[PDB]
């Protein structure tokens, strides 16, 4: 289930291509002698969208580490229960 | 696709052969062909419990497969009508320039059928405006997830009743595959090839006594007829001595022949028992072989629904960010993120339905 | 062995969330993980 | 934690 | 037969042995940290200048 719920969320980060839309703003910011009403405005949503990219990539980690740490609890709930060394007395008595 | 047409046959093979199995206490008792094994695990009260679990496990699949089929059709129909609407929206916003894009917001364009883009819901009604399509699609994606979770539950309930583990309710179900392998291991570990040799040791032991007591009764009666040649008085003497011991050895001859007749009757039933178990081992052997193929098939089935239930869920939760306060560049990358799982769910149902109906007509062969 | 490459990814991935740069070594770093994850999906699908 | 959930079961067992 | 009865009882106590030792050590950690909190908090009085507070 962690294998199935983490494959699609990674591809949401790869082909997001919102930095390419920033590159569309990059030809619209410096390359024209552009209106400062819109030069401030183009950088405004750019500052949102990079933070939206940070909130994208951090909401991966919450969904990511919400399963990895959820798995590390489960290994330690298995790796502690010794059952062989608690029975080697009980085997050899019956084996005798 | 992952869930091949041979996978769906292997399940329906398992469903077919399981319904052949009886589920009454009498019909299982006939099917196993015995009465009351000396060992515990093969007693028919356990067995009729076990087949009744299988017979109930088989009848669930008619509900399950119908839920798989009817949902995956809807996953294609929603998988296209959303994808038709969504690809048109991302195309027509790129007609707007990037300079004018930021000055506009989402609420600026919730007023009309934007560039004749429409949408049809699950309810076969049409929606034209962007402020109405995005709200209708929000209901529909929410509607498809809760249908899909009802599907994946019934799939995983069908799998984990077979292989074992926690069901959806929380009941740990013992796995049907090891429950067959538990009994099949019990049918190999049996003393039936030993006790029959042990009982035929005792019968051939007790026959040696009976073959000896016949010599005794043919001797004491020979001794008991000593008297009346001249000894009419001695007739009661040796007849008192030996005629008792002739009678006592004959009563031993009465008792032991009746015991050997009873001990032979145990060998007759246990010889019929050892045949009955060894035949029954082959019956479970196919049932175990059917479950191993049903094991692998459901695992690929569960993983595709788990892939689809993920992609519907991560589509819906990202789509909840959509509101009129979004500026128009930030709307697109958000909305483009919504539809990219719907490409694969469209592709997964296409990989499913093509690999579904082709196994149906093939199952008639 | 699997807990490591969950955490060592996520530590390295949260390392990039500090700087928040739009590098494509980011998507290169996902690609090695995403292939590894797709590798790990495959043996469950080729379990057969 | 140190006192795991399997510890508390082993007592209640 | 009775040896096997005690064998599980002994096996139950060995797991109960290890479990209580981790239980005691966490309470002993907590009972320490409450105690060393209280005793240092008894230094608090109005004569303390404000950096030292």
XYZ file of C-alpha atoms in Angstrom:
575
model
C 0.000 0.000 0.000
C 2.928 2.318 0.626
C 4.339 1.059 -2.659
C 1.078 1.899 -4.417
C 0.448 5.237 -2.695
C 3.917 6.621 -3.444
C 4.370 5.866 -7.148
C 1.815 8.461 -8.410
C 2.820 11.177 -5.958
C 6.419 11.159 -7.216
C 5.342 11.729 -10.824
C 3.362 14.734 -9.602
C 6.752 16.234 -8.735
C 8.660 15.244 -11.889
C 6.402 16.473 -14.697
C 4.887 19.387 -12.771
C 6.616 21.714 -15.307
C 5.639 24.852 -13.393
C 9.241 26.061 -13.554
C 8.731 26.108 -17.325
C 5.809 28.454 -16.729
C 8.215 30.547 -14.659
C 10.455 30.514 -17.741
C 7.508 32.008 -19.630
C 7.501 34.767 -17.017
C 11.300 35.025 -17.353
C 10.884 36.114 -20.965
C 8.139 38.488 -19.790
C 10.092 40.123 -16.945
C 13.579 41.120 -18.065
C 13.353 40.872 -21.860
C 10.791 43.676 -22.354
C 11.124 47.173 -20.975
C 7.971 46.251 -19.154
C 5.415 48.060 -17.007
C 6.323 48.068 -13.305
C 2.622 47.593 -12.538
C 3.011 44.179 -14.167
C 6.703 43.594 -13.378
C 5.671 43.609 -9.733
C 2.593 41.550 -10.618
C 4.482 38.913 -12.632
C 6.949 38.495 -9.774
C 4.024 38.394 -7.328
C 2.425 35.179 -8.575
C 5.919 33.842 -9.292
C 6.615 34.244 -5.578
C 3.347 32.418 -4.916
C 4.136 29.657 -7.392
C 7.626 28.903 -6.074
C 6.088 28.772 -2.602
C 3.324 26.662 -4.138
C 6.107 24.441 -5.465
C 7.584 24.311 -1.966
C 4.150 23.496 -0.565
C 3.891 20.917 -3.343
C 7.200 19.251 -2.526
C 6.592 19.439 1.229
C 3.133 17.902 0.894
C 4.927 15.028 -0.799
C 7.084 14.525 2.307
C 4.080 14.533 4.640
C 2.510 11.847 2.475
C 5.939 10.253 2.067
C 7.304 10.195 5.629
C 3.777 9.562 6.867
C 4.317 6.071 5.430
C 8.050 5.521 5.953
C 7.910 6.286 9.672
C 4.676 4.300 9.679
C 6.764 1.387 8.397
C 9.613 1.837 10.896
C 7.118 1.338 13.701
C 6.108 -1.960 12.132
C 9.611 -3.399 11.789
C 10.431 -2.652 15.431
C 7.155 -4.319 16.394
C 8.479 -7.431 14.637
C 12.207 -7.250 15.331
C 11.803 -7.402 19.133
C 9.853 -10.605 19.806
C 12.508 -13.226 20.469
C 10.954 -16.670 20.119
C 13.930 -18.914 19.434
C 15.994 -18.212 22.558
C 12.856 -18.528 24.705
C 12.295 -22.113 23.574
C 15.746 -23.727 23.402
C 15.147 -24.990 26.921
C 11.689 -26.118 25.857
C 12.935 -27.894 22.731
C 15.760 -29.887 24.314
C 13.643 -31.004 27.262
C 11.069 -32.509 24.898
C 13.864 -33.694 22.607
C 15.316 -35.573 25.566
C -2.056 -4.492 -18.227
C -1.042 -6.178 -14.981
C -4.230 -8.135 -14.298
C -4.144 -10.359 -17.371
C -6.966 -12.368 -18.901
C -5.379 -15.532 -17.528
C -5.566 -14.067 -14.039
C -9.329 -13.565 -14.239
C -9.796 -17.117 -15.506
C -7.774 -18.557 -12.603
C -10.150 -16.857 -10.189
C -13.226 -18.057 -12.061
C -11.711 -21.524 -12.195
C -11.371 -21.319 -8.418
C -14.945 -20.059 -8.126
C -16.200 -22.878 -10.353
C -14.509 -25.728 -8.520
C -15.343 -24.332 -5.079
C -19.088 -24.360 -5.741
C -18.740 -28.062 -6.549
C -17.697 -28.624 -2.939
C -20.494 -29.474 -0.492
C -21.275 -27.340 2.524
C -23.764 -29.329 4.594
C -22.573 -31.496 7.453
C -23.888 -34.579 5.647
C -22.633 -33.704 2.168
C -19.121 -32.960 3.373
C -19.244 -36.214 5.362
C -20.082 -38.056 2.144
C -17.431 -36.153 0.168
C -14.671 -37.116 2.595
C -15.909 -40.710 2.732
C -15.278 -41.628 6.360
C -16.453 -41.336 9.961
C -14.411 -39.821 12.802
C -10.658 -39.912 12.231
C -8.702 -40.779 15.370
C -6.699 -37.572 14.936
C -8.297 -34.246 15.712
C -7.643 -32.029 12.707
C -9.479 -34.226 10.194
C -12.699 -34.634 12.171
C -15.689 -33.727 9.969
C -17.040 -31.026 12.276
C -13.848 -29.100 11.558
C -14.100 -30.038 7.886
C -17.705 -28.944 7.363
C -16.746 -25.671 9.013
C -13.891 -25.340 6.533
C -15.876 -25.989 3.355
C -18.652 -23.681 4.539
C -16.025 -20.958 4.715
C -15.009 -21.831 1.153
C -18.593 -22.102 -0.108
C -19.291 -18.664 1.333
C -16.009 -17.419 -0.107
C -17.016 -18.570 -3.582
C -20.484 -16.987 -3.550
C -18.988 -13.581 -2.770
C -17.196 -13.413 -6.132
C -20.401 -12.960 -8.146
C -20.931 -9.768 -6.193
C -17.243 -8.859 -6.410
C -16.716 -9.322 -10.152
C -19.919 -7.424 -10.915
C -18.624 -4.598 -8.730
C -15.272 -4.706 -10.530
C -16.854 -4.633 -13.988
C -19.520 -1.971 -13.458
C -17.126 0.383 -11.684
C -14.363 0.100 -14.281
C -16.822 1.051 -17.024
C -17.590 4.177 -15.006
C -13.872 4.771 -14.507
C -13.524 4.885 -18.289
C -16.553 7.132 -18.866
C -15.443 9.544 -16.174
C -11.885 8.937 -17.371
C -12.688 10.466 -20.763
C -15.301 13.149 -20.064
C -13.043 14.727 -17.450
C -10.050 14.322 -19.762
C -11.972 15.855 -22.675
C -12.977 18.820 -20.524
C -9.625 19.194 -18.782
C -7.424 19.089 -21.869
C -9.570 21.748 -23.536
C -9.226 24.044 -20.515
C -5.418 23.831 -20.350
C -5.293 24.488 -24.103
C -7.510 27.587 -24.161
C -5.807 29.318 -21.234
C -2.484 29.145 -23.096
C -4.202 31.318 -25.717
C -4.110 34.071 -23.091
C -0.708 35.778 -22.791
C 1.425 35.384 -19.691
C 1.370 39.142 -19.002
C -2.438 39.275 -18.890
C -2.575 35.872 -17.175
C -1.472 37.113 -13.758
C -3.842 40.101 -13.763
C -6.746 37.672 -14.155
C -7.920 35.306 -11.428
C -10.089 32.197 -11.460
C -13.205 34.129 -10.417
C -12.845 36.328 -13.504
C -13.682 33.323 -15.708
C -16.464 31.624 -13.710
C -19.075 33.525 -15.712
C -19.520 31.726 -19.036
C -18.952 28.619 -21.112
C -15.268 29.373 -21.684
C -14.501 28.625 -25.367
C -17.475 26.200 -25.763
C -15.967 23.764 -23.242
C -18.640 21.669 -21.564
C -18.876 18.618 -19.317
C -21.324 15.778 -18.684
C -21.678 14.451 -15.147
C -22.337 10.941 -13.865
C -26.065 11.788 -13.916
C -26.020 12.255 -17.745
C -26.681 15.998 -17.377
C -24.587 18.644 -19.055
C -22.657 21.571 -17.578
C -21.216 24.432 -19.619
C -19.838 27.200 -17.408
C -16.421 27.027 -15.768
C -17.885 27.980 -12.398
C -20.360 25.105 -12.743
C -18.162 22.426 -14.331
C -15.466 22.669 -11.641
C -18.150 22.331 -8.982
C -19.847 19.461 -10.817
C -16.518 17.698 -11.328
C -15.759 18.147 -7.618
C -18.919 16.223 -6.765
C -18.149 13.555 -9.355
C -14.546 12.871 -8.320
C -15.777 12.712 -4.723
C -18.431 10.281 -5.946
C -15.937 8.068 -7.791
C -13.571 7.724 -4.829
C -16.230 6.461 -2.438
C -17.385 4.017 -5.089
C -13.775 2.917 -5.591
C -13.197 2.433 -1.871
C -16.273 0.201 -1.804
C -14.653 -1.770 -4.626
C -11.168 -2.065 -3.113
C -12.708 -3.117 0.198
C -14.595 -6.005 -1.410
C -11.527 -7.009 -3.421
C -9.274 -6.984 -0.370
C -11.984 -8.697 1.677
C -12.022 -11.389 -0.993
C -8.238 -11.645 -1.045
C -7.593 -11.544 2.681
C -10.265 -14.114 3.387
C -8.301 -16.401 1.068
C -4.728 -15.668 2.117
C -5.441 -14.484 5.644
C -4.965 -11.446 7.819
C -7.137 -8.580 8.995
C -10.358 -8.097 7.052
C -12.124 -4.766 6.606
C -14.203 -5.190 9.762
C -11.135 -6.015 11.855
C -11.682 -9.768 12.031
C -8.507 -11.752 11.589
C -9.486 -14.462 9.131
C -7.401 -17.605 8.979
C -6.210 -18.041 5.428
C -7.977 -20.514 3.196
C -4.709 -21.441 1.474
C -2.926 -22.467 4.724
C -6.116 -24.091 6.037
C -5.902 -26.421 3.065
C -2.165 -26.818 3.630
C -2.821 -27.522 7.306
C -5.100 -30.447 6.503
C -2.911 -31.635 3.630
C 0.033 -31.771 6.016
C -2.128 -33.777 8.422
C -3.028 -36.294 5.729
C 0.637 -37.042 5.102
C 1.520 -37.409 8.791
C -0.619 -40.401 9.662
C -0.073 -43.702 11.458
C -2.428 -45.506 9.091
C 0.417 -47.253 7.302
C 1.731 -48.216 10.762
C -1.290 -49.105 12.912
C -2.614 -51.486 10.253
C 0.757 -53.217 10.423
C 0.498 -52.994 14.212
C -3.004 -54.465 14.301
C -2.062 -57.224 11.866
C 0.765 -58.019 14.254
C -1.727 -58.523 17.078
C -4.176 -60.516 14.954
C -1.375 -62.818 13.829
C -0.347 -62.919 17.477
C -3.841 -63.840 18.628
C -4.301 -66.319 15.790
C -1.308 -68.214 17.165
C -3.131 -68.529 20.491
C -6.363 -69.675 18.830
C -4.427 -72.177 16.723
C -2.929 -73.358 20.011
C -6.186 -73.568 21.971
C -7.671 -75.821 19.295
C -4.810 -78.181 20.112
C -5.760 -77.861 23.786
C -9.463 -78.588 23.323
C -8.598 -81.498 21.060
C -6.345 -82.802 23.842
C -8.352 -82.288 27.046
C -11.467 -83.814 25.467
C -9.191 -86.673 24.483
C -8.121 -86.844 28.110
C -11.655 -86.365 29.452
C -12.895 -89.545 27.744
C -10.476 -91.685 29.756
C -12.782 -93.170 32.354
C -15.367 -95.729 31.274
C -13.034 -98.393 29.798
C -13.012 -100.023 33.224
C -13.242 -96.992 35.479
C -16.875 -95.849 35.656
C -15.852 -94.210 38.939
C -12.853 -92.646 37.185
C -15.140 -91.239 34.477
C -16.261 -88.567 36.915
C -12.677 -88.172 38.136
C -10.852 -87.193 34.952
C -14.006 -85.680 33.505
C -14.083 -83.525 36.606
C -10.415 -82.664 36.134
C -10.078 -82.281 32.384
C -13.663 -81.621 31.307
C -13.501 -78.358 33.205
C -10.249 -77.472 31.468
C -11.683 -78.579 28.143
C -14.628 -76.281 28.809
C -12.427 -73.411 29.996
C -10.119 -73.591 26.981
C -13.184 -73.723 24.743
C -14.477 -70.570 26.439
C -11.119 -68.998 25.661
C -11.675 -70.282 22.131
C -15.104 -68.634 22.222
C -13.684 -65.337 23.438
C -10.590 -64.914 21.284
C -12.211 -65.769 17.937
C -14.830 -63.127 18.696
C -12.031 -60.684 19.492
C -10.059 -61.473 16.320
C -13.298 -61.047 14.367
C -13.593 -57.652 16.046
C -9.912 -56.837 15.535
C -10.148 -57.770 11.857
C -13.109 -55.393 11.576
C -10.929 -52.530 12.777
C -8.342 -53.380 10.118
C -11.048 -53.449 7.444
C -12.250 -49.965 8.345
C -8.758 -48.529 8.742
C -7.742 -49.971 5.380
C -10.811 -48.260 3.964
C -9.805 -45.222 6.012
C -6.285 -45.034 4.580
C -7.750 -45.240 1.088
C -10.266 -42.541 2.027
C -7.632 -40.127 3.328
C -5.149 -40.639 0.490
C -7.891 -40.003 -2.052
C -8.963 -36.930 -0.098
C -5.392 -35.602 -0.144
C -5.632 -35.386 -3.919
C -8.944 -33.552 -3.609
C -7.347 -30.830 -1.508
C -4.272 -30.883 -3.750
C -6.199 -29.389 -6.644
C -8.034 -27.063 -4.252
C -4.647 -25.936 -2.971
C -3.464 -25.612 -6.569
C -6.525 -23.531 -7.416
C -5.842 -21.213 -4.486
C -2.187 -20.644 -5.409
C -3.299 -19.386 -8.807
C -6.043 -17.421 -7.076
C -3.347 -16.104 -4.729
C -1.240 -14.525 -7.459
C -4.242 -13.279 -9.436
C -5.811 -11.252 -6.639
C -2.471 -9.666 -5.736
C -2.239 -8.170 -9.199
C -5.921 -7.270 -8.962
C -5.519 -5.516 -5.612
C -2.458 -3.585 -6.763
C -4.268 -2.097 -9.749
C -7.240 -0.970 -7.673
C -4.831 0.331 -5.045
C -3.137 2.270 -7.827
C -6.490 3.604 -9.004
C -7.831 4.374 -5.521
C -4.635 6.319 -4.872
C -4.869 8.328 -8.074
C -8.517 9.217 -7.557
C -7.757 10.260 -3.972
C -4.741 12.414 -4.805
C -6.778 13.952 -7.609
C -9.604 14.943 -5.266
C -7.458 16.358 -2.476
C -5.436 18.562 -4.815
C -8.682 19.645 -6.486
C -9.908 20.998 -3.138
C -7.368 23.819 -3.506
C -9.451 25.192 -6.393
C -11.216 28.413 -5.430
C -11.873 31.790 -7.041
C -9.035 33.475 -5.122
C -6.513 31.570 -7.256
C -4.732 33.711 -9.792
C -4.875 32.284 -13.242
C -1.358 30.876 -13.688
C -1.573 29.165 -10.289
C -4.965 27.769 -11.307
C -3.551 25.972 -14.347
C -0.657 24.111 -12.686
C -3.067 23.187 -9.892
C -5.699 21.993 -12.367
C -3.114 20.286 -14.580
C -2.015 18.379 -11.473
C -5.622 17.220 -11.039
C -6.042 15.636 -14.459
C -2.685 13.837 -14.731
C -3.863 10.926 -12.519
C -6.953 10.730 -14.721
C -4.786 9.848 -17.714
C -3.681 6.652 -15.990
C -7.061 5.708 -14.507
C -8.393 6.026 -18.043
C -5.461 3.859 -19.093
C -5.890 1.360 -16.272
C -9.580 0.749 -16.957
C -8.724 0.434 -20.645
C -6.116 -2.136 -19.650
C -8.738 -3.719 -17.425
C -11.886 -3.864 -19.585
C -9.927 -5.148 -22.591
C -8.463 -7.818 -20.302
C -11.880 -8.477 -18.747
C -14.391 -9.288 -21.484
C -11.820 -11.288 -23.444
C -11.538 -13.609 -20.460
C -15.329 -13.875 -20.179
C -16.022 -15.430 -23.581
C -12.845 -17.487 -23.217
C -14.242 -18.839 -19.936
C -17.051 -20.401 -21.999
C -14.369 -22.610 -23.590
C 17.645 -2.180 3.640
C 14.388 -0.537 2.579
C 13.978 1.800 5.590
C 17.310 3.379 4.653
C 16.325 4.306 1.100
C 13.041 5.641 2.359
C 14.741 7.902 4.899
C 17.965 8.698 3.016
C 15.789 9.845 0.140
C 13.471 11.877 2.373
C 16.383 13.450 4.239
C 17.990 14.361 0.918
C 14.623 15.477 -0.424
C 13.976 17.722 2.570
C 17.528 19.000 2.083
C 16.385 20.393 -1.260
C 13.233 21.854 0.317
C 15.532 24.097 2.355
C 16.942 25.932 -0.671
C 13.771 25.604 -2.834
C 15.756 26.010 -6.042
C 14.147 25.015 -9.356
C 17.105 22.797 -10.343
C 16.604 19.730 -12.482
C 19.058 17.788 -10.380
C 15.923 17.681 -8.223
C 14.087 15.764 -10.942
C 17.294 13.820 -11.536
C 17.263 12.885 -7.848
C 13.614 11.848 -8.066
C 14.367 9.815 -11.201
C 16.814 7.495 -9.456
C 14.320 7.038 -6.635
C 11.330 6.749 -8.971
C 13.100 4.096 -11.040
C 14.092 2.266 -7.846
C 10.493 2.430 -6.683
C 9.355 1.293 -10.131
C 11.989 -1.439 -9.891
C 10.468 -2.426 -6.579
C 6.936 -2.438 -8.008
C 8.135 -4.779 -10.732
C 9.105 -7.815 -8.666
C 5.680 -7.742 -7.043
C 4.246 -7.703 -10.548
C 6.724 -10.325 -11.745
C 6.182 -12.409 -8.599
C 4.177 -14.692 -10.873
C 9.455 4.597 22.806
C 11.165 1.981 24.962
C 8.083 0.248 26.361
C 6.670 -1.031 23.081
C 3.158 -2.237 22.342
C 4.460 -5.803 22.272
C 5.773 -5.353 25.798
C 2.347 -4.435 27.166
C 0.782 -7.427 25.425
C 3.348 -9.815 26.941
C 2.328 -8.621 30.389
C -1.376 -8.933 29.619
C -0.715 -12.362 28.157
C 2.611 -33.219 31.733
C 2.903 -30.718 34.574
C 6.430 -29.802 33.460
C 4.961 -28.521 30.211
C 2.387 -26.519 32.158
C 5.110 -24.665 34.035
C 7.159 -24.406 30.836
C 4.692 -21.979 29.303
C 4.285 -20.234 32.664
C 8.058 -19.858 32.768
C 7.978 -18.671 29.158
C 5.287 -16.135 30.024
C 7.375 -14.804 32.904
C 10.529 -14.378 30.805
C 8.594 -12.119 28.457
C 7.054 -10.443 31.491
C 10.595 -10.112 32.859
C 11.907 -8.060 29.951
C 8.719 -6.015 29.597
C 8.636 -4.695 33.153
C 12.327 -3.771 33.037
C 11.650 -1.405 30.170
C 8.528 -0.235 31.987
C 10.390 0.469 35.226
C 13.190 2.320 33.450
C 10.799 4.756 31.788
C 9.003 5.559 35.034
C 12.373 5.825 36.760
C 13.360 8.278 34.042
C 10.140 10.221 34.560
C 10.254 10.127 38.368
C 13.795 11.478 38.160
C 12.882 14.310 35.817
C 9.883 15.389 37.871
C 12.015 15.311 41.027
C 14.926 17.292 39.602
C 12.399 19.748 38.201
C 10.802 20.332 41.602
C 14.007 20.689 43.598
C 15.500 23.238 41.212
C 12.160 25.068 41.191
C 12.448 25.556 44.961
C 15.213 28.093 44.283
C 12.583 30.419 42.789
C 11.927 33.409 45.037
C 11.442 37.149 44.585
C 15.038 37.936 45.594
C 16.247 36.452 42.297
C 17.437 39.020 39.811
C 15.843 38.630 36.456
C 18.644 37.049 34.402
C 19.271 34.494 37.158
C 15.531 33.788 37.233
